[PDB]
Every structure is written in C-alpha cells, then in structure tokens.
Design a protein around this ligand. Structure first.
Ligand SMILES: Nc1nc2c(ncn2[C@@H]2O[C@H](COP(=O)(O)OP(=O)(O)OP(=O)(O)O)[C@@H](O)[C@H]2O)c(=O)[nH]1
Ligand SMILES: Nc1ncnc2c1ncn2[C@@H]1O[C@H](COP(=O)(O)OP(=O)(O)CP(=O)(O)O)[C@@H](O)[C@H]1O
Ligand SMILES: Nc1nc2c(ncn2[C@@H]2O[C@H](COP(=O)(O)OP(=O)(O)O)[C@@H](O)[C@H]2O)c(=O)[nH]1
Ligand SMILES: [Ca+2]
Ligand SMILES: [Ca+2]
Ligand SMILES: [Ca+2]
Ligand SMILES: [Cl-]
Ligand SMILES: [Mg+2]
Ligand SMILES: [Mg+2]
Ligand SMILES: [Mg+2]
Lengths: 54, 348, 425, 440
C-alpha cells in the first residue's frame, strides 16, 4: 500500500494509493447529411400535395 | 395477486414450484417476456440480471444468485478454494486438485505427483470437466486425454479408500439440497440421498467405471445390478443412519453430517460478499446441490456444487413446498421446518 | 407550439363545440362578455392556446363556427356564451346538407368551403406559433361529416406541417336521425384515417348507455349526452390548457399516442360519471373507474383488445405519490392488456385545478385495438344496405359513383385488420 | 489558467445548469448580481474560479455558459429568475417550437436552422478565452432537443474545435419521470452519433436519483427541483478540481487520462455520499470510513448496477470536508478486505484521491443537510453496461414492430440509421463484456 505524488496546498491535498501493480466528419459531410434529410422531407411533402391535388 | 414468469421449461424442481404457486390461487403466470413480474424462475444460461429491479411498484425476486457460478464450476471451485484465505490451501475437506488447460497448473501438478511416485503413496487421480472421465495412476495418460479434449479439465486426487456399504462392498456419494434465501439464511434440507453403486468396488481396474462412478445415469445403464439393494440405487438417511448404528456403532449426524454442514456453510460464507442481494434493487435465492464423499475413516470430502440440481423423486413434493414457504412466501406473503438453519457464532 | 385554431361544423359540432367553450371559459375564469374574473394565475398562463387577446384585455376564442344552415348557429349566438365568439368567425350558408355526405363534401359545401378557409387563414396569420387545428363534428350527418372532412383535406393542403385533431361523434342506431348515417360515417372515416393525427372517438351508443344505465336518466336528450362530451373534452385538453410536463402540446401528444400513422383513433374515458353528488372520491376510486369500460365514451370492451398507448390525467388536489402507486397497480395487475413491445406505454399527468362541481376527477385517453369493434359495427350497418344499393340515389344524384363507396368500405375494413394485426403481435 | 465553456441543451440541460451555477456562485461567494467581494483583482485575473467565470470592468462575474432550447418557456425562466443579472442575453438562445421528443426533428429539421447561430454565440465566448480547454455539455438522452440537437452540436464542435476536449453530463431516461415513450430510441440514436466526439461522459439515471431522494431525503414524490439540486452536488464535486486549487483533475484532458484508457469506454460510474435530509432532527455525522464504504453500495450510485460483477479500469475519490490522507488509506485498507474490487489485469489496483478542505455547500432552504465531510467516487467499471442492456432491450422491443418509426422518417431520417445506431450499441455492449468478463 504505497502513497505517491502527494501534493498539498492551503485548500487541500491530493495523492495516489496503489494496492497492487498491473498483473471525424468535416463540415461539408455534415451539411450533406442535413441537406439529404431536408430533400427527403421536401419529396414526401411534394408527394402529399400531389395526392391532394388529385 | 402476485405474478411470476417461467424461463426454464427443463427444470423439474421449479416446474413443481410453478404448479404449487398456481394452486394457492394467489399467483398468476405471465408470458416469459412480460417484464411486470414479482418472481423470475430464470434460465440457466445468460440470465439477464442486469434487467432486474428496474420496475417501479414491483418487488422483484429471482431463483438464482448472480456470480454463484464460481461455486458451481469445476475449474472455478478449485480456484476459489486455493485463492480464498478463509478456505486456503490448507483445506482439509477438499481433495487435492489442479486446473489443466488442453492460467494453467500443469507445472505444479507434476510436482506433487512425483512425491507420490517417490513416496510410494497411492498416486491415483481422476480427471473431469464441467462423460469425460478417466482414472489412472499414470499422469502421462491423464495429461493426454485432456489434450484430446477441447475444454478446461481438472485433475483431482481419487479417494482410493472410500467407505463401502455392506452387503455389496460398493461405492456411493451423498447429495444434500441447500436453500439460500434473500436474507442469505442457509437452509439444509433434512432429507439427503445416497446415490449408491450397485457393483462391488475394485481398486485394481480403474477403467471399469461402473463400480467407481456412482452416477444414477451410469448406474441405470452400464450396471447390471441396478435396483438390487435399494430402489434405483438411492438409499435415504433413515436407512443409512440405521446402517451406521448397526455396523459402525455411530449416527449419521455425528460421523458425517457435522462435516457436511461445516462444508456447506464454509463455501457459502466465503462467496457471500460477492453475491449477496442484501442492499440490491433486486433479490436472489437459489437451490444448490452439494455432492460429498466419505472415506473409510468417516471423513467427508466435497466433490462438486450443482447450481441447478434435480431432486429425488419422492422428495420433490416436500422440498418444492419448502422452497415456496421459505424463499418465496417470505418475500411475498400469502393470505416443524423441513430445513436446518446453518448458523454458528463462535467468539474469539 | 402555442395557438390552436378550433373549428366546429354542423349541428352536432356546433352544439358540443358551444358547450366546450362554456366549460373551459369557466375554468379559465372568462365570463360571457369575455372578461377575466378568476383568482388563480394558473388560469391565464396558457390561455393563449385557445383565446386571442383583444383591447381591454378581452379574451376571444380562436373558434370558427361553420354550418350549411343558419338554424343551430342562431341558437349558439343566443346561447349562454353566445356573445363571446368573434362575429366574423360565423360562416354559414342557407341550403343545408340534408344529412348527405355528398352534399357537404362535393356540392353544397364546396360552395362554402373557401369562405371558411378565409377565416382560418386570418386566425392562422396572427398566430405566433400555430401548432394545429381541432375540429368538432358528427360523422352521421352531412355538413359536419361531409364538409368537415373537406375542410380537413383543404387545411392539410395549406398547412401540411401542422397537427390535425378531431372530436368525432360516431352514429348509433340507438340514437339515430336517419338510416344513411352508416354511409356518411364510413365515407368520413376514410377521410380521417388519412388526414388526421389524433381522433377522439365519441360513440353516441356509449353516451346513451351511460346516461341510461349509470346516470339513471330514463329518457336521455342530446343535452344530456353533451354534458358527458363537454366534460371529456375539458379533460383531454387539460394538458394543453394548463402548465404541465406531459403531452403539453398536440404534437408531443401524437408522438406518445400514435405508434402507427393510421391507428390514431382514441377511446376517451372520464370519472366520476356525473349528471346535471358530494361524494369525496379517492385516488384508488378514480383509477378504477377511469379504466372501467362503463366509463368509456366508445362502446368497446377494453378486454377484447390491448392498449398500445394510454394517457391519464388526474385533476384536483391529491397525493402525487398515491396517483403513481395506483397507476402502477392497474398496469401490474392487468399487464396482459398492455402490449409488451411498447415499454412504459402509460403516461400520467396531474393538474391542481379540478373541473367545475368536482373536487377530484380523472380523464382517460386510450389507444386500444378494441376500437375495431366500433368500426366493425359501422361496417356491418354499411354493408347491410350497400349490398342492395339501398338509399344510394341520394348520393349518386350529387355525382358520386358506387365505386367510391366500395373503396371507402375496403379502407375501413383494412383499418379493422390493422388493429387485429397488433392485437395478436 | 485555461477556460472551460459550459453548454446546456434542452429542458434537462438548462434546468440542471441553473442548479449548478446557483451552487457554483454560493461556493465561490458570488452574489446574484454578479459581484464577488472576496475577489480583489477587479476587472480580470487568472485564478482557478476564472475557469468558469469571466470578469467585467464593473466587477461582474459572468458564467462561461451557453443555454440552448428549441422552445422558450424554460430558458425564459432564467431570463426572469433570481440570476437574471448573471447571464448576458446573447448567452441565452431560444427557438419557437421544440423537437417534440423526436431525435430526428431536433437533429435534422429544427437543428439545421439554429446550429449556425449557436456556434457563433459559442464563438463569442471562445474569443474571450486566453486558452480554451474545451466544453462541458449538459443534456438529456430522452428529449428531442437534448438528444437530437446535442449530437449535431457535438459533431460541429469537433470540426470547429478539433483539439479541444468535450465532457458530457447526460441524463439517462427513467419511466418514473419520463415524458415520452420513444426516449429509448432517442437515447441509442444520440449515443451512436455522439460517441466518437465525446471524451468522457457522466451518465445519471433519473431512476437512481429518484430513489435516493425517496430513501435518503424522505421525499414522497421528488420533483425536478429535488433531482437537480442533488445532481448539481455531484456535478460540483466533479468540476471542483477545475475551479479550486489542487493537483488532481486540473484540466479536462486529465479526466480522460485518469478515467478513460479505452476511448469508446468513456462512461465512468459516479457514486456519492452521504445524502442526509435537512429535516432530520437528529443526525450522527458520518466518518471517512463510513462514507468511503458507502461508495461501494449500489444504492448510492448515479446508475443502479453491480460493480462486483464487472471490472475496474480506474477509480477516483473526490473528498470535500474534514478529511486527511491517513484516514482515507485506513478506510481503503479496511474496505479492500471486505468487498469485491477486481481491476483489469492491465491496470494497477489503486485509487487517485483528491481532497478539498471546504465541506459541501448546500442551497439555503434546500433538502440536503450540511455535512462535515462527503465524497464522490468516479469509477470506470464495466458494470455500467447494464444500463446499455436495459436501454437496448426496450429499443429492440419497439423497433421489431417499427413502432413510432414513422415519426422519425417523416422528419427526413432514414430507417437505416436505427439499425446503424443499434449495431453500434451492440458493438459497445460487446466491448464491455470482453474487458470485464472471463470465459466461464
Ligand atoms: N434530472 C432531470 N431530468 C429531466 C429534467 N427535465 C427533463 N428531464 C428528463 O429529460 C427527458 C426529456 O427530455 P427534455 O430535456 O425534457 O426534452 P428537450 O431536451 O427539451 O427536447 P424537446 O423534446 O424538444 O422538448 C425526460 O426523460 C425527463 O425525465 C430535469 O430538470 N432534471
Ligand atoms: N475425486 C474423486 N474421487 C473419487 N470418486 C470421484 C471423484 N470425483 C468424482 N468421482 C466420482 O464421480 C461421480 C460424479 O461425478 P461429479 O461429482 O464430477 O458430477 P458430474 O459433473 O460428473 C455429473 P453432471 O454432469 O450431471 O453434473 C461421483 O459419485 C464419484 O463416484
Ligand atoms: N352527441 C350529439 N350528437 C348529435 C347531436 N345532434 C346530432 N347528433 C348526431 O349527429 C348525426 C347527425 O348529424 P348532424 O350534426 O345533426 O348533421 P349536420 O348538421 O349536417 O352535421 C346523428 O347521428 C346524430 O346522432 C347532438 O346535439 N349531440
Ligand atoms: Ca348553390
Ligand atoms: Ca478577479
Ligand atoms: Ca475527438
Ligand atoms: Cl482547435
Ligand atoms: Mg341534424
Ligand atoms: Mg377566394
Ligand atoms: Mg423541450
């Protein structure tokens, strides 16, 4: 049970005790995903207004 | 109205528990995938303990202790005993055992095997896995069969001086049923059974495995005297006790049962802090099946612990009722105990 | 998600719609002149959901009154809260619909629908954040049924991204005006399956049985039936009209209640059942009664199906702890009636303000597969006539072909099959 | 000194943020009007508390925080509340209509039309920093905004601040206070998209906080106010090292170093004690040994699980109050011989300990009693994977029938993202099992 790296100050103190030793997508790609979803919405809405038009 | 689920259709014990519960008219059975249950009679493999105790308004109970496999696996049990201070290497009631892979203990196994080659002592050992048994005084053989297989085996000292029932000069093992409830009260069923051998023991041919293996399965098939002395090679305590009184001038309680109660309690108190559901969000109980051996010195030896045991045919009714009484009805009350409570507080 | 635009069409729609505004105006402390005289500030925190605010802090319902004849709408204007409604929001014709769906949908109503949409547009433009529309109507008549579903189709075209809710009254032979009610209902359901997010199925069969069997009213009138509806409507809109966490707007309600687009027909419930008593009702009693089939506004046995989703709303001062305990009690003791493949499908809300006359009340909103019994009933009444093409000349005279009846039938039978699919899943 | 920017998203994120900054102010002696008498360097400085607060020439101390919510009612209560003066209007951002408990609606639909605004408002704070450490992001798993918009924000923050660290404080869904049936969906979806962009995430199961409030504070039916004040104490314990003088976890980078050896396994289990009711007439103050022993009871964890049936990769003990190293080591020594604490073979069995002499501060009129010493244990145990198993099971039950899926597809999302996200969670559950379990 070894204590190590003991640091002390006015407000407190810290240390470590050992009981046993060791036995991203770019902005372009994001904007494409958001736009691809936006277009899928526009298509679904267009199909609705087409159905209602009929 | 309490609710429960069945997820092990191949369990004779809890099939009877299921029946008894329904008969009270206060327990209803749900589909095995309905989460709103009070009780789970769970499966043997990969029981989802992680999904228990997260249903508001339901006190949930399960018929298995998570981590209990440490006691109920051959390799695990050996490791547990040899690495647990409260059991230690200086364990007088467990046969000398070593875990062998096809980490491993093949190195240390041969060390003690040599002192028995040197020391002229009976150097017979048995190998088994958690079908698949061999008994021989030659280690060269033992290590070969293990490599021929593909899973972990354990080599254990074969008790060459077993107690023998007369008439017969035959082998046996004792099976005790232990119930551990949610409070971790250890209940020993007052009715055990002797799975006897129906063939005379013979310490010259360790390959004739019908007088050496007292398994009810191996006996009901490979043996030709199955059912001669007792109905299906199963002697019960009332008879075995009378036999001990007449033959050895002793009782079952004194000569054997003290050791059994000691071994059961010692094994379970060891793993208690690792599996106890005292302050958990769900609670566990479980039925265990301890298998023991008795040498000619009337000394008891632990063989294995079974985490999913079956019962003797005539003992199902009484045992299964006791499970509902102590393990289930204790948590879920309905609108001369058959158990012995294993407790002992010696001050020192 | 703030403003809701209310619409009421036809005789039934305007009469239940009128009562609805009488009730919630009292709850919000608004008087017939549109002045606030309440005591609590919970009443005005979300008043803008249903009311527009004028000068002098007058509160004007965001309501549009529609009918193809001036009869019922003259009665509304003369009624108790008649003067609260915006005069320009009264839109009416003269011909009537004669209990003909075709007249309300294709001929008579087509002539009037544009003027209604002009009023709808006016209201919608002044909305800071319009969340959608709620319609009150019957399906057995001509205007509310025929023109109501026409309005819905037009509103969706102009507002495709807003929620469409309806309080639809189902016809029953036990409370019937004409024999062609099954025709009008079937033609209307076909529209509702496609163009609404959430429909509260209010069965006249159920409303009558409650008045007769429970409330001991030997001769129930439409006024007696509407006492139950206005109470139910006040209940299911509680989460929308007051501060809350659960189902506080129409969209969030739809997300919690509608696992599949077409299965959005709800079974409303209310407790305690009242008629025009001082019994202090306990939380366990509210919980038992609200789930009781005899408190359901749709003549369907809940035990003949399974609950996909449920929304409970307790009103009054009571133990939050006890409410939770009782709601968990009904689920755990009748778990077989709630589908296991939608975990925790019962959400509960509580409001400190009870309705008028009661200390404690509970409103039930259930999406049960047992609702199919309702559509099965209409389908049988429909087929009984349609197999002989009886009374069809009323519709073919307005330009409809038999093919359109066949289609409407098949789509409602599909709806029944879809409920049965998830009842066995 | 290096700055940290807090980001609060959705109702849960904002309301928890409110409780935290309320607690920060009390602990640092900052008044509601932003003044801080004890601070003698007017109009600037680089003290430890400056990590979370900036300074104006007037002597005003302003949280380096951004509040975001797709609807205004919640953040409006901040603009009018007790600490209205504390925040600058540009820090508080609100849309008009919310994500309606829909991940896709929060991520794709509404997220797209506000994301640029939020980043620019964050950029305003980032420009005020001399050396930005990174971000602390508070949000819920269940909400549409908390799940959907957060994931979008976490993706963009990795693009605009690729070198900066990102910590999460996530609220795991609990039916006892949940407001939607589809919270399991939103959870898997946001966890999948956020996984690679988060360095260390502290999960808090509302279930755990709820029962702790019932059990230890004698609250019959806890409100978010009860939950948040408790949650804020744990968050305070975790961030205290960034705001006070010390030598353990002094930057966001060190959290990853100490608690997260494997990057995907970045969900440390938090355990806190003691939790004492302020209404408790008589209370015997608990010792170092007693509260340290409590750190290994599931009943005190932020997530209900069983660390006994898993393995540790790291363990940190954060003490606040009358505690010295000698008492800690004595307690740890006793505990080690009574409990099941098994680390992975490739890690040392040990504890990194931090002590601040100032005991826990509590809100006046709050539910928590003041104690002379408390502790928050941060342990990276594989047992937390139980929470993932619970969540993924509910997901599989609903998705097998495609229940509520149409709500997401209708927002432009593809049905494929459901299986992609679920498959990622299946991999995550498998990683935990490899590290934590031996072949039985
Ligand atoms: N602990 C805690 N949990 C909260 C709080 N507020 C909401 N939650 C949880 O968050 C989940 C819902 O997410 P919200 O944060 O409310 O929703 P949102 O982020 O505003 O996103 P929207 O759906 O667009 O409104 C529920 O499961 C709640 O239990 C809170 O103040 N404290
Ligand atoms: N160390 C030993 N010394 C002597 N005999 C032994 C022995 N180990 C096992 N046996 C014999 O093996 C028999 C049962 O084997 P074990 O006790 O290993 O159960 P099993 O695992 O073999 C059966 P199951 O697969 O149904 O659990 C005992 O009754 C005994 O006869
Ligand atoms: N609950 C209720 N139902 C009504 C009322 N008036 C008519 N109905 C029902 O609605 C159907 C008739 O539709 P109605 O609204 O009168 O015709 P419309 O004016 O063309 O919409 C019948 O099935 C009636 O049972 C009423 O005041 N209350
Ligand atoms: Ca005309
Ligand atoms: Ca300063
Ligand atoms: Ca990164
Ligand atoms: Cl950077
Ligand atoms: Mg009429
Ligand atoms: Mg025009
Ligand atoms: Mg919100």
């Amino acid at each position: 049970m070894e204590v190590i790296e003991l640091n002390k100050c006015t407000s407190g103190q810290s240390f470590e005790v050992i009981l046993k030793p060791p036995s991203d997508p770019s902005l372009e790609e994001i904007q494409k995903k958001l736009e691809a979803a936006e277009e899928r919405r526009k298509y679904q809405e267009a199909e609705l207004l087409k159905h209602l038009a009929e | 109205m309490y609710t429960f689920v069945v997820r092990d259709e191949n369990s004779s014990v809890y099939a009877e528990v299921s029946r008894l519960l329904l008969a009270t008219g206060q327990w209803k059975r749900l589909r095995k995938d309905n989460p709103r249950f009070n009780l789970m009679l769970g499966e043997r493999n990969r029981l989802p303990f992680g999904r228990l105790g997260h249903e508001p308004g339901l006190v949930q109970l399960v018929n298995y202790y998570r981590g209990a496999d440490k006691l109920c696996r051959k390799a695990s049990l050996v490791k547990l005993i040899k690495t647990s201070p409260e059991l230690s290497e200086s364990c007088t009631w467990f046969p000398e055992s070593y875990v062998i892979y096809p980490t491993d203990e093949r190195e240390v196994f041969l060390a003690a095997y040599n002192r028995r080659r040197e020391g002229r002592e009976g150097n017979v050992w048995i190998a088994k896995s958690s079908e698949g048994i061999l008994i021989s005084s030659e280690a060269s053989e033992l290590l070969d069969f293990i490599d021929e297989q593909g899973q972990v085996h354990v080599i254990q000292k074969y008790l060459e001086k077993p107690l023998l029932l007369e008439p017969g000069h035959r082998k046996f093992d004792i099976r005790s049923w232990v119930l551990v409830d949610h409070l971790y009260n250890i209940y020993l069923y007052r009715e055990g059974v002797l799975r006897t051998s129906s063939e005379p023991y013979n310490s010259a041919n360790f390959q004739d495995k019908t007088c050496h293996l007292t398994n009810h399965c191996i006996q009901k098939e490979y043996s030709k005297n199955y059912g001669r002395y007792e109905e299906g090679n199963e002697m019960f305590f009332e008879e075995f006790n009378q036999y001990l009184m007449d033959a050895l001038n002793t009782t079952l309680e004194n000569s054997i049962l003290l050791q059994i109660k000691h071994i059961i309690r010692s094994c379970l108190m060891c793993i208690e802090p690792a599996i106890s559901t005292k302050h958990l969000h769900y609670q566990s109980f479980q039925l265990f099946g301890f298998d023991f051996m008795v040498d000619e010195e009337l000394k008891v030896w632990l063989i294995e612990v079974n985490g999913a045991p079956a019962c003797a045919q005539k003992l199902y009714a009484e045992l299964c009722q006791g499970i509902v009484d102590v393990a289930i009805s204790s948590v879920f009350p309905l609108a001369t105990s058959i158990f012995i409570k294993l407790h002992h507080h010696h001050h020192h | 998600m703030r403003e809701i635009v209310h619409i009421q069409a036809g005789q039934c729609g305007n009469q239940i719609g009128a009562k609805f505004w009488e009730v919630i105006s009292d709850e919000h402390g608004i008087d017939p002149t549109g002045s606030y005289h309440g005591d609590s500030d919970l009443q005005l925190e979300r008043i803008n959901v249903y009311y527009n605010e004028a000068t002098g802090n007058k509160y004007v319902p965001r309501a549009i009154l529609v009918d193809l004849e001036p009869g019922t709408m003259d009665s509304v204007r003369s009624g108790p809260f008649g003067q609260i409604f915006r005069p320009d929001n009264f839109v009416f014709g003269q011909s009537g619909a004669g209990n003909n769906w075709a007249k309300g949908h294709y001929t008579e109503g087509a002539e009037l629908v544009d003027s209604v949409l002009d009023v709808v547009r006016k209201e919608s433009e002044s909305c800071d954040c319009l969340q959608g529309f709620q319609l009150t109507h019957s399906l057995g008549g001509g205007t509310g049924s025929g023109m109501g579903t026409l309005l819905i189709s037009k509103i969706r075209e102009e507002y495709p991204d807003r929620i469409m809710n309806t309080f639809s009254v189902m016809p029953s032979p036990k409370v019937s005006d004409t024999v062609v009610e099954p025709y009008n209902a079937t033609l209307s359901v076909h529209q509702l399956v496609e163009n609404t997010d959430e429909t509260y199925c209010i069965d006249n069969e159920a409303l009558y049985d409650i008045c007769f069997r429970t409330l001991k009213l030997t001769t129930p009138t439409y006024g007696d039936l509407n006492h139950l509806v206005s109470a139910t409507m006040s209940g299911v809109t509680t989460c929308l009209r007051f501060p809350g966490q659960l189902n506080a707007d129409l969209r969030k309600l739809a997300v919690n209640m509608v696992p599949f687009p077409r299965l959005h027909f709800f079974m409303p419930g209310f407790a305690p059942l009242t008629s025009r008593q001082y019994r202090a009702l306990t939380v366990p009693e509210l919980t038992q009664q609200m789930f009781d089939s005899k408190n359901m506004m749709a003549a369907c046995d809940p035990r003949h199906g399974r609950y996909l989703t449920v929304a409970a709303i307790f009103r009054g001062r009571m133990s939050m702890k006890e409410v939770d305990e009782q709601m968990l009690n009904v689920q755990n003791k009748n778990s077989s009636y709630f589908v296991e493949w939608i975990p925790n499908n019962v959400k509960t809300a509580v409001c400190d303000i009870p309705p008028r006359g009661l200390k404690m009340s509970a409103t039930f909103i259930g999406n049960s597969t047992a609702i199919q019994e309702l559509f099965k009933r209409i389908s049988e009444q429909f087929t009984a006539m349609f197999r002989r093409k009886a009374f069809l000349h009323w519709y073919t005279g307005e330009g409809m072909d038999e093919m359109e009846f066949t289609e409407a039938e098949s789509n409602m039978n599909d709806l029944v099959s879809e409920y049965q699919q998830y009842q066995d899943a | 000194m290096r700055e940290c920017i807090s980001i609060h998203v959705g109702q849960a994120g904002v309301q928890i943020g409110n409780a935290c900054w309320e607690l920060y102010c009390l602990e640092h002696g900052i008044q509601p009007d932003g003044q801080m008498p004890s601070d003698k360097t007017i109009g600037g400085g680089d003290d430890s508390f400056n990590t979370f607060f900036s300074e104006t020439g007037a002597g005003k101390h302003v949280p380096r925080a951004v509040f975001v919510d797709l609807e205004p009612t919640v953040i409006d209560e901040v603009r009018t509340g007790t600490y209205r003066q504390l925040f600058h209007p540009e820090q508080l951002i609100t849309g008009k209509e919310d994500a309606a408990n829909n991940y896709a609606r929060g991520h794709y639909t509404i997220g797209k039309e506000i994301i640029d605004l939020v980043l620019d408002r964050i950029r305003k704070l980032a420009d005020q920093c001399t050396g930005l450490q990174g971000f602390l992001v508070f949000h819920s798993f269940g909400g549409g905004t908390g799940s959907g918009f957060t994931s979008l924000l976490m993706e963009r923050l990795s693009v605009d601040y690729g070198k900066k660290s990102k910590l999460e404080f996530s609220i795991y869904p609990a039916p006892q206070v949940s407001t939607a049936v589809v919270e399991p969906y939103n959870s898997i979806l946001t966890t999948h998209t956020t996984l690679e962009h988060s360095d260390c995430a502290f999960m808090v199961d509302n279930e755990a906080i709820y029962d702790i409030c019932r059990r230890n504070l004698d609250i019959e039916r806890p409100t978010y106010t009860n939950l948040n004040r408790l949650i804020s104490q744990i968050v305070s314990s975790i961030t205290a090292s960034l705001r006070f003088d010390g030598a353990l976890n002094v930057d966001l980078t060190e959290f990853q170093t100490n608690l997260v050896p494997y990057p995907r396994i970045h969900f440390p289990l938090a355990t806190y004690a003691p939790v004492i009711s302020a209404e408790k007439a008589y209370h015997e103050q608990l010792s170092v040994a007693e509260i340290t022993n409590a750190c290994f009871e599931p009943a005190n964890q932020m997530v209900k699980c069983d660390p006994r049936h898993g393995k540790y990769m790291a363990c940190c003990l954060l003490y606040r109050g009358d505690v010295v190293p000698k008492d800690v080591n004595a307690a740890i020594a006793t505990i080690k011989t009574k409990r099941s604490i098994q680390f992975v073979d490739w890690c040392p069995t040990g504890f990194k300990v931090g002590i601040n002499y100032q005991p826990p501060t509590v809100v006046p009129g709050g539910d928590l009693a003041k104690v002379q010493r408390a502790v928050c244990m941060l342990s990276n145990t594989t047992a937390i994977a139980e929470a993932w198993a619970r969540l993924d099971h509910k997901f599989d039950l609903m998705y097998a029938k495609r229940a509520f899926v149409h709500w997401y597809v209708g927002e432009g999302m593809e049905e494929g993202e459901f299986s992609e996200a679920r498959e990622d969670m299946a991999a995550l559950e498998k990683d935990y099992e490899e590290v934590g379990v031996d072949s039985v």
